[PDB]
Design goal:
This is part of a larger assembly, with chains A, B, C and D.
Chain A (H helix, E strand, L loop, with lengths): L1 E4 L7 E6 L5 E6 L4 E5 L6 E6 L6 E6 L7 E6 L4 E7 L2 E8 L6 E6 L7 E6 L4 E6 L5 E6 L7 E6 L9 E6 L4 E6 L5 E7 L6 E6 L8 E7 L3 E7 L11 E4 L4 E6 L5 E6 L4 E6 L5 E3 L2
Antiparallel strand pairs in A: 2-3, 3-4, 4-5, 6-7, 7-8, 8-9, 10-11, 11-12, 12-13, 14-15, 15-16, 16-17, 18-19, 19-20, 20-21, 22-23, 23-24, 24-25
Chain B lengths: L14 H13 L3 H11 L1 H4 L4 H8 L1
Helix pairs in contact in B: 1-2
Chain C lengths: L10 E5 L3 E6 L6 E6 L8 H6 L8 H14 L2 H13 L20 H16 L3 H13 L4 H10 L8 H18 L2 H8 L19 E3 L6 E3 H8 L13 H5 L2
Antiparallel strand pairs in C: 1-2, 2-3, 4-5
Classes of the chains: A mainly beta, B mainly alpha, C mainly alpha, D mainly alpha.
The structure holds zinc ion (6 copies).
The site of one zinc ion has 6 residues of chain D, from loops.
PDB class: signaling protein
Keywords: Complex, mTORC1, Signaling, Nutrients, Amino Acid Sensing, signaling protein
Entry title: GATOR2 complex bound to arginine sensor CASTOR1
């Protein structure tokens, strides 16, 4: 079925992500506002209209319900705002202004890792807002993460204490994979370089228990790659060109089982890709 | 019975497993079970086991 | 503003379990569309509702799972569940002495069957069926070197791959939680190998108990469930509005 | 409304305790509880964990309680635990064999 939602925004939409339970939808636009709808039973209830940003809001990311109703938003105004809902209302809860350029993407860490939000800014700085209770956040900034500027950040699923890894894609035409050391410092470990233009969105594939790590990354030119790592010990990623697009590709999103990829590009077209038995990704839409 | 006398499984999904079961029963001296299965199944597994081994089991 | 990326006007994202949140440039703001894609995924919410996992009885659970799969319309699932019904029979339990008989795991219809089915549904990326099989065939599992090797060889689930099976169960539990079946998620997660006197009845309380944070008087859970459905103060007469001051 | 000296006498406190003890033998626990409410009204003398199902920290308002089990130290929201214990008879936490509802009998 189709549940069409009228955003009622004052400008073009830049992202739209529903909650973990799939009941509440939060959208962001250039109108400096974030609207959280209630799309249960195909409804439209404007639960809140959060306006705390001085610039356009790029990406929103719900948190796991294990930590409560938490929404994160990154905006062009160098400002990261975390909205937590309490007593039936959505209100500003935490404020982050550690970046000197526009924060492009926010992606919450898996709930096993705790309550960690990774932000990527256009200045090449990556900040991880670890949460330690009592309503304070500690920031472990990864300075100079990318030469020109980080565009997207995606976390690696908890795989077996816990080794925390995430993928970053910047404007330096490359993908950087990060892991924290034993002390806590985050050190670059492997560099991925196959895109001929800006890496706009890197998205890890959620793990289902398979011994294979998959990364889908889109680029400014229009190249979408599938970075498979069949052997964890080898830690070698072999890119596979999913498709060559005539325009820019903006966002890539995996399924819950990581078998269907939602490739959305600048041509105002949304394509669903499923891997065939022959190893070639074929469009479904 | 379930495998043979039955958005579905591949048609020849269990052929390798049936051959392995036949060889497992034959290699431990239970040629009776292997021959009985071969006769009951007939052509469903006959084309998968080579003629020489089938003749050896039958004899 | 040279290094900032160009603003996105269209995007697609998988949200929830079987929903796709894609918005497009209008070509006055865009339009956000939520499309149900439960048919695209290899897992079924209805199957998750209908599957049961009773450790005590495995044949009954396999039979009900086959019936539910037929109700949904998965012929392969019906066949696999009937195969599990046959292959998880309690009369096939391995003996402690390796010299008595060949274990059913060494039989090609045992461990080899299970490995083939798991490989096929890993190719299909069916976390549901993978977790279901790895729980059904684990519930049945509930000189010295040879004995240890026989113990390792008498299990239809490979001991050297228990991490993968636990990952299957954890991923399916997360999927069930995403759907909203907390009871089903807790039921599935139980198969993972790696993990005061009542103020009303005045009987010692040792099982489930509710104790108010404000005052500290409580007891058996059912007793407070019955008592607070009508009254509002603490049953010991302390006057604490326990429902208002504890159910935060 | 007896005076403090009269109600503090050992004899009147003995009848009340005997009546309450007698009223427990009839399993009139709810009726006895109202007696203690009445007694405390006039007599001055009187007496963050996560839910195992929904993984949330601390009529139908009773369901927001936390049924802390004294044996396995596990618990959760009363609505979640009661729903889980309605069909099953084991602690929802994995690798726990306690029977939270069947233990008290
Ligand atoms: Zn009690
Ligand atoms: Zn009290
Ligand atoms: Zn109280
Ligand atoms: Zn317990
Ligand atoms: Zn709960
Ligand atoms: Zn207990």
């Amino acid at each position: 079925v189709i549940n069409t939602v009228d955003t009622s925004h004052e400008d073009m939409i830049h992202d739209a992500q529903m909650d973990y339970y799939g009941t509440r939808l939060a959208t962001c636009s250039s109108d400096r506002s974030v609207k959280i709808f209630d799309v249960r039973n195909g409804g439209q209830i404007l639960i809140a209209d959060l306006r705390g940003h001085e610039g356009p809001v790029w990406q929103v990311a719900w948190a796991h319900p294990m930590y409560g109703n938490i929404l994160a938003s990154c905006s062009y105004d160098r400002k990261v705002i975390i909205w937590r809902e309490e007593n039936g209302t959505w209100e500003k809860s935490h404020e982050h202004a550690g970046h000197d350029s526009s924060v492009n993407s926010v992606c919450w860490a898996p709930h096993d890792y705790g309550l960690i939000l990774a932000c990527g800014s256009s200045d090449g700085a990556i900040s991880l807002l670890t949460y330690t209770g009592e309503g304070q956040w500690e920031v472990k900034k990864i300075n100079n993460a990318h030469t020109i500027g980080c565009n997207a950040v995606s976390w690696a699923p908890a795989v077996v204490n816990y080794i925390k890894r995430f993928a970053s894609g910047g404007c330096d035409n490359l993908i950087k994979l990060w892991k924290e050391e034993e002390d806590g410092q985050w050190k670059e470990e492997q560099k991925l370089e196959a895109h001929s233009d800006w890496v706009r969105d890197v998205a890890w594939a959620p793990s289902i228990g398979l011994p294979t790590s998959t990364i889908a990354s889109c680029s400014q030119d229009g190249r979408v790659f599938i970075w498979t790592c069949d052997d964890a010990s080898s830690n070698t990623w072999s890119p596979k060109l999913l498709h060559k697009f005539n325009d820019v590709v903006w966002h890539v999103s995996w399924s819950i089982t990581a078998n269907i990829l939602a490739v959305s590009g600048g041509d105002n077209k949304v394509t669903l890709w499923k891997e065939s038995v022959d190893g070639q990704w074929v469009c479904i839409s | 019975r379930i495998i043979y006398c039955s958005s579905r499984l591949p048609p020849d999904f269990f052929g390798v497993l049936v051959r392995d079961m036949l060889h497992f029963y034959a290699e431990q001296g239970d040629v009776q079970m292997a021959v009985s299965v071969l006769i009951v199944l007939g052509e469903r597994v006959r084309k998968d086991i080579d003629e020489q081994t089938q003749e050896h089991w039958y004899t | 503003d040279a290094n900032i990326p160009f603003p996105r006007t269209s995007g697609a994202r998988f949200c929830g379990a079987g929903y796709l949140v894609y918005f497009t440039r209008p070509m006055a703001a865009g339009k956000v569309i939520i499309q149900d894609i439960a048919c695209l995924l290899p897992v079924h919410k209805s199957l998750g509702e209908l599957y049961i996992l009773n450790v005590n009885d495995i044949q009954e659970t396999c039979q009900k799972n086959a019936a539910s799969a037929l109700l949904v319309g998965r012929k392969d699932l019906v066949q696999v569940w009937s195969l599990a019904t046959v292959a998880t029979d309690l009369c096939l339990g391995p003996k402690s002495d390796p010299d008595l008989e060949t274990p059913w795991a060494r039989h090609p219809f045992g461990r080899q069957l299970l490995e083939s089915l798991l490989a096929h549904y890993c190719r299909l990326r069916d976390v549901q069926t993978l977790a279901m099989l790895c729980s059904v065939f684990e519930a049945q599992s509930r000189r010295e070197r040879e004995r240890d090797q026989h113990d390792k060889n008498k299990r239809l689930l490979d001991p050297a791959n228990t991490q993968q099976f636990d990952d299957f169960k954890k991923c399916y539990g997360e999927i069930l939680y995403r759907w909203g079946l907390r009871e089903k998620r807790a039921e599935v997660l139980k198969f993972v190998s790696c993990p005061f006197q009542c103020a009303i009845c005045h009987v010692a309380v040792r099982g489930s108990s509710n104790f108010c944070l404000t005052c500290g008087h409580g007891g058996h859970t059912s007793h407070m469930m019955e008592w607070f459905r009508t009254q509002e103060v603490c049953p010991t007469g302390c006057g604490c509005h326990c429902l208002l001051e504890s159910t935060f | 409304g007896s005076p403090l000296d009269v109600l503090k006498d050992e004899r009147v406190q003995y009848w009340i305790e005997n009546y309450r003890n007698l009223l427990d033998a009839w399993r009139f626990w709810h009726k006895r509880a109202e007696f203690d409410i009445h007694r405390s009204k006039l007599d001055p003398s009187s007496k963050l964990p996560r839910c195992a199902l929904c993984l949330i920290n601390m009529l139908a308002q009773f369901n927001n309680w936390f049924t802390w089990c004294h044996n396995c130290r596990h618990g959760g929201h009363a609505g979640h635990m009661l729903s889980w214990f309605r069909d099953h008879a084991e602690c929802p936490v994995s690798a726990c064999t306690c029977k939270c509802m069947q233990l008290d009998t």
